[PDB]
Amino acid sequence: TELQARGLTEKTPDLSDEDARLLTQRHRVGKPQFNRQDHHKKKRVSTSWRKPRGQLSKQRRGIKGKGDTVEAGFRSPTAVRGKHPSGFEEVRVHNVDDLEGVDGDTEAVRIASKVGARKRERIEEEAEDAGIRVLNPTYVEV
Amino acid sequence: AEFDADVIVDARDCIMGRVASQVAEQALDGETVAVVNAERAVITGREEQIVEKYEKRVDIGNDNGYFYPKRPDGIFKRTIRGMLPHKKQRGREAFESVRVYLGNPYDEDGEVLDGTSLDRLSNIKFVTLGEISETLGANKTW
Amino acid sequence: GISYSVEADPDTTAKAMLRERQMSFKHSKAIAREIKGKTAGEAVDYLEAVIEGDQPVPFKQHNSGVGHKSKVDGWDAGRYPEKASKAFLDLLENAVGNADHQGFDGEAMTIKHVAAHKVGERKPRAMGRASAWNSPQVDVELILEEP
Amino acid sequence: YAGLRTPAESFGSGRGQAHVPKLDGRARRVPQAVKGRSAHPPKTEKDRS
RNA sequence: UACCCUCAGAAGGGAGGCGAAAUAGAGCAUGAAAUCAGUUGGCGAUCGAGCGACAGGGCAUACAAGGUCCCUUGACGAAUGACCGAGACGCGAGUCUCCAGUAAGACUCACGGGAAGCCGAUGUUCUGUCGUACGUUUUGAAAAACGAGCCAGGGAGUGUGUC
RNA sequence: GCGCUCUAAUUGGAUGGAAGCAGGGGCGAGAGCUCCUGUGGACCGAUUAGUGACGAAAAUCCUGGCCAUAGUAGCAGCGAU
Ligand SMILES: [Cl-]
Ligand SMILES: [Cl-]
Ligand SMILES: [Cl-]
Ligand SMILES: [Cl-]
Ligand SMILES: [Cl-]
Ligand SMILES: [Cl-]
Ligand SMILES: [Cl-]
Ligand SMILES: [Cl-]
Ligand SMILES: [Mg+2]
Ligand SMILES: [Mg+2]
Ligand SMILES: [Mg+2]
Ligand SMILES: [Mg+2]
Ligand SMILES: [Mg+2]
Ligand SMILES: [Mg+2]
Ligand SMILES: [Mg+2]
Ligand SMILES: [Mg+2]
Ligand SMILES: [Mg+2]
Ligand SMILES: [Mg+2]
Ligand SMILES: [Mg+2]
Ligand code: NA
Ligand code: NA
Ligand code: NA
Ligand code: NA
Ligand code: NA
Ligand code: NA
Ligand code: NA
Ligand code: NA
Ligand code: NA
Ligand code: NA
Ligand code: NA
Ligand code: NA
Ligand code: NA
Ligand code: NA
């Protein structure tokens, strides 16, 4: 009658108090957009980031208000870096074989988008039976 | 008419500037203020010079404009406007909620703020707004 | 060319289009804007009065240099685009024609939608010369709806 | 000689146009011009062994 | 692209037929940006200009791909760190001792309770802070120094020989 | 260290819908990676080792397209009104 996602969409990993504090930190602090200088002033200039090289550039010079310049002090904590917001580490999956070795508590799975409906169904279920969650599940009517 | 003044200040024999400074402060706190007897407010100094400063402000101008009030009504209000960010939303709001009246159009007497009263007994060098206005060429209607 | 930008319901609605018409595109925007919401019939009477000069079409966007017309309400400038107007009458004659051939009351139908679109480039022919200047080429959709 | 087969010449200053060699009103030869030569192209004289 | 209606009409349009698909209908695969029409959301005819960045408010939001978030209380608690009161000085503003490194104190968590446009995020707008593009030339560029109307695509350390 | 072309070895995806495109979600300080929906309708990757006509906001840069300019100038001036 209604649509319901296959799999363990509610499953949550188990993280050591530290990693949970760290994950929580990242989510709290966040980071600046880090978009290219003046991208919003000229259409031809895309949002993608390029270091400002102008000798007189206001950003390059760090004038307050002209945007944060990309630098290492902005990195996320080692422990959680790359972690999906749920806390899960992801594993790119293309076929059923790829599901082997994946710990359903530590990692969730993302099925390459290129995979077709047929091969998905196989994966989606076998994945669940292995205790693994699939971040991008098929929604069926039940 | 009809101004739900939260506060009514009596300018009679009071230093215009000092009053205006406090009226601004309060208006920037909502305090709907009304100033009374501006014709009788006073500013210290040597009359002859004081008048010059004001007389000049009237000559100053051009196509664009520089409207300067000659009535004590206006003189005082512009003095107040000068102490507020009347171009900013909140500033124009405070100013808008402040009015100067000639004489007292209310019932309640006005209250005198602290440190704004000039002691006529120990002060011979000062001027009355009305006197200034009479000089500026204003039409005495008070 | 264009395709209907709005969606209609065949049971309570008629359609009509104009293709590659060589006429001011700026005048069309005005007329459309002007006759939308009117009744196929009201529009016709209107447009004919415009072609006459008794009724002016409000020029709200393309009005540089245009002199003020007293009959314009809420606005000031306007003119009497008789070429563009004669072409809207064709669109209407057609929209109201299809209307009745479907058991509808064309004249009393509402102009739910009408919009002009510049299409450009006429395109030379085989045994035919080329386009002189860059005369605009207009397309215009119309959707009649039962009251 | 790809791109070089033309007598194109730049008009120089004076008409509010970049100094780009042109012929019949179309720019030619130089690398930044559509149909112009290829600056640093592949070469036969190169030893790929 | 037959048939029918309309039209001055081999035009065009409506209806219709073919095909998986006509938004594959003739310069007909896909169909970006600049840009145009219509329209939805936000703003708006008393108000100020590098168009934003970071904070924080309004309003707006189908699903999916993110799921957080608010308040009571409590635990932990770095630097910092009191009010009141008791006594004691100072012409005075005020200070000293004690109460006390106490109460307080960012982040984080636990119990109970709450939110589903609700939290993030996104669109627009409001407020605060800062802020006169970019690249180049230059001792010094927002410059009344030089370049560009806008967008897309194109556009500049390569080969041989020798050291 | 990220990205592009094509070669090889190893290994995968796709008409149960590839590339591309539009809008949207997640990750990375970032170059960028990835997912969802729509479109599309036939190709597309990953890792390693290679290859190079390999990355643009600029050059009065080139070519094409387009907007404002504007429903504006011109369609009068001539001894042939
Ligand atoms: Cl690093
Ligand atoms: Cl003046
Ligand atoms: Cl101000
Ligand atoms: Cl005195
Ligand atoms: Cl036009
Ligand atoms: Cl923490
Ligand atoms: Cl180099
Ligand atoms: Cl790196
Ligand atoms: Mg841009
Ligand atoms: Mg005119
Ligand atoms: Mg060539
Ligand atoms: Mg096509
Ligand atoms: Mg110099
Ligand atoms: Mg390019
Ligand atoms: Mg391999
Ligand atoms: Mg550059
Ligand atoms: Mg051009
Ligand atoms: Mg003009
Ligand atoms: Mg004659
Ligand atoms: Na004074
Ligand atoms: Na004046
Ligand atoms: Na206009
Ligand atoms: Na009128
Ligand atoms: Na009018
Ligand atoms: Na030649
Ligand atoms: Na030029
Ligand atoms: Na060779
Ligand atoms: Na907002
Ligand atoms: Na230069
Ligand atoms: Na500059
Ligand atoms: Na200057
Ligand atoms: Na131009
Ligand atoms: Na190159």
Hey, what are A40's tokens? 């919003």
Q: Whole-number Å distance, CA A29 to C1' F29? A: 14
Beta carbon of A26 within 7 Å of strand F? Answer: yes
Ligand 14: centre distance to CA C139 (Å)? 35
Cβ–Cβ < 8 Å for C116, C29: yes
Cα–Cα distance between C84 and C90 in angstroms, integer?
Answer: 10
- The ligand with the least distance to the CA atom of D17 is 26
Beta carbon of C22 within 7 Å of strand E? Answer: no
Is A42 exposed, middle or buried, given 0-12, 13-18 or 19+ CB atoms closer than 10 A? exposed
Nearest to C121 by CA among C140, C107, C135, C141: C135
Backbone angles phi, psi at B48, to 5 degrees: -40, -45
Beta carbon of A64 within 7 Å of strand E? Answer: yes
Name the CATH superfamily for C1-147: Ribosomal protein L22/L17 (3.90.470.10)
Q: Look up residue C70 and give its amino acid.
A: S
The neighbourhood of ligand 10, an ion, using CB within 5 A, equals C 65
Q: Whole-number Å distance, CA B11 to C1' E99? A: 48
Cα–Cα distance between C118 and C134 in angstroms, integer?
Answer: 12
Please tell me the number of Cα atoms within 13 Å of C49 on its side-chain side.
12
Q: Whole-number Å distance, CA D31 to C1' F56? A: 15
Cα–Cα distance between B79 and C106 in angstroms, integer?
Answer: 69
Question: With the C-alpha atoms ordered B65, B68, B74, B78, is the resulting torsion angle positive or negative?
Answer: positive
Beta carbon of A56 within 7 Å of strand F? Answer: no
Hey, what are B136's tokens? 């500026």
Nucleotide nearest to A83 (CA to C1'): F27
Residue spans per domain, chain C: 1-147
CA-based max dimension of chain B: 46
Residue spans per domain, chain B: 1-142
- Tell me how long chain A is: 142
Cβ < 7 Å from strand F, D residues 1-49? 2, 12-14, 16-20, 22, 25-27, 31-34, 36, 38, 40-42, 46, 48
CATH of domain B1-142: 3.90.1180.10
Q: Considering only CA atoms, which residue is closest to the C1' of nucleotide F32?
A: A48
Nearest to A84 by CA among A140, A32, A15: A15
Q: Whole-number Å distance, CA C117 to C1' E147? A: 37
- The ligand with the least distance to the CA atom of B62 is 2
DSSP state of D27: E
Is B100 exposed, middle or buried, given 0-12, 13-18 or 19+ CB atoms closer than 10 A? buried
Which DSSP string do the residues of chain B spell out, in sequence order?
Answer: -----SEEEE-TTBBHHHHHHHHHHHHTTS--EEEE-GGG-EEES-HHHHHHHHHHHHH---SS------SHHHHHHHHHHTTTTTTSHHHHHHHHTEEE-SS--SSSPPBPPTT-B--GGG--SEEEHHHHHHHHT-----
Question: With the C-alpha atoms ordered C110, C116, C117, C120, is the resulting torsion angle positive or negative?
Answer: positive
Cβ < 7 Å from strand F, A residues 57-86? 70-72, 74-76, 80-85
Hey, what are A10's tokens? 């509610």
Hey, what are B87's tokens? 């171009």
Nearest to A104 by CA among A20, A23, A10, A13: A13
Name the resolution in angstroms: 2.8
Q: Where are the alpha helices (DSSP H) in chain C?
A: 25-35, 40-52, 82-100
Cβ–Cβ < 8 Å for C89, C48: yes
Backbone angles phi, psi at C87, to 5 degrees: -75, -25
Ligand 14: centre distance to CA A104 (Å)? 46
- Cα separation values, B35 from B119, B136, C33, Å: 20, 21, 54
Residues 6+ apart with CB under 8 A from A31: A74, A76
Q: How far is CA A9 from the centre of its chain?
A: 16
Cα–Cα distance between C130 and C118 in angstroms, integer?
Answer: 19
What's the 3-state SS for C49-74? HHHHCCCCEECCCCCCCCCECCCCCC
